[PDB]
Structure formats: structure tokens, C-alpha cells
Amino acid sequence: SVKSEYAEAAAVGQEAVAVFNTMKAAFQNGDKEAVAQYLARLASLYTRHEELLNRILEKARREGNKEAVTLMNEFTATFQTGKSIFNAMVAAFKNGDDDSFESYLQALEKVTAKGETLADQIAKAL
Ligand SMILES: Nc1ccc2c(c1)S(=O)(=O)C=C2
């Protein structure tokens, strides 16, 4: 069901949270080789999450589930904010700009905590 596809999507999202926090520890410790690998892993996890979210939104639309579509439109919008900040974080790592990396990192943590009530609302609406 779309609801079980959203649970699969949620888990992938939580995997990115898990890796992201491990990455943050590596960054603070100066283990740049680890950070590079974690950033690669996170790109794969975000790409997969984005795709699952789009399939869920498209299915909710085909089902006529207006409330779920409204919530998923808000949610996917926020996901594009994370994407843009994540992209700038990766660029800051490439450029050796630790100040920008720190900034973007705290931004992404706010994105995830800011949207978790909406994430839970979606589960109940699908
Ligand atoms: N693409 C992408 C990258 C990072 C983050 C997200 C999306 S999010 O908005 O799910 C939270 C962090």
C-alpha cells in the first residue's frame, strides 16, 4: 500500500539521519576520509528518498487523497531545501571551507527537526 511504501521511505530517511550524525562526528574529529565516504553514502540515500517520496505523492494524487497530497506537497518542498543546503555542504567540503560546512550542517539539522511533525502527519493521512 502507499502507507507501507511511506514506512519504507521513512526508514530510508532515518538511515540518512543515522549516517549524517556519524558524519558530523567524523567532521568534528577531522577524519576527512570518513567524511567523504559518508557524504557519498548520504547522496545515495537522499536520492533514493527523493524518488520514493515522489512516487508516494504521485500515488496519493492518483488516489484523490487531497489531504495527503497537500501534506506531501509541503513535505517535498522542504525536501528540496535540504537538498540545496546539502549540495552547498558537499561543495564546502570540496572547497575546504569548514566554516561554511559547519553552517550548512546546523541548517540541515534544523530542517529535519522542523519537518518531523509533518512527516508523522503524512503517515496518518495516507
Ligand atoms: N536531498 C536532501 C539532503 C539532505 C536533507 C534532505 C534532503 S531533508 O530535507 O530530508 C533533510 C536533510
Tell me which residue has cell 509541503. 74
The structural domain count of the chain equals 1
Instruction: Name the CA dihedral angle for 32, 91, 107, 75, rounded to a multiple of 10 degrees.
Output: -120
Per residue, what are the HEC states of the chain?
A: CHHHHHHHHHHHHHHHHHHHHHHHHHHHHCCHHHHHHHHHHHHHHHHHHHHHHHHHHHHHHHHCCHHHHHHHHHHHHHHHHHHHHHHHHHHHHHHCCHHHHHHHHHHHHHHHHHCHHHHHHHHHHC
Q: Whose CA is nearest to atom 12 of ligand 1?
A: 82
| Final resolution, Å | 1.6
Instruction: State the structure-solving technique.
Output: X-ray
Ligand 1 geometric centre to CA of 102 (Å): 16
Q: Within 6 Å (CB) of ligand 1, which residues are found?
A: 46, 78-79, 82-83, 86, 108, 111-112
Containing domain of residue 99, as a range? 1-126
Q: For ligand 1, atom 5, which residue shows the shortest CA distance?
A: 82
Atom of ligand 1 nearest to the CA of 13: 10
Q: Which one of 14, 84, 112 would you pick to mutate in the ligand 1 pocket, going by the greatest count of ligand atoms within 8 A of its CB?
A: 112
Short-list 49, 30, 43, CA closest to 98: 30
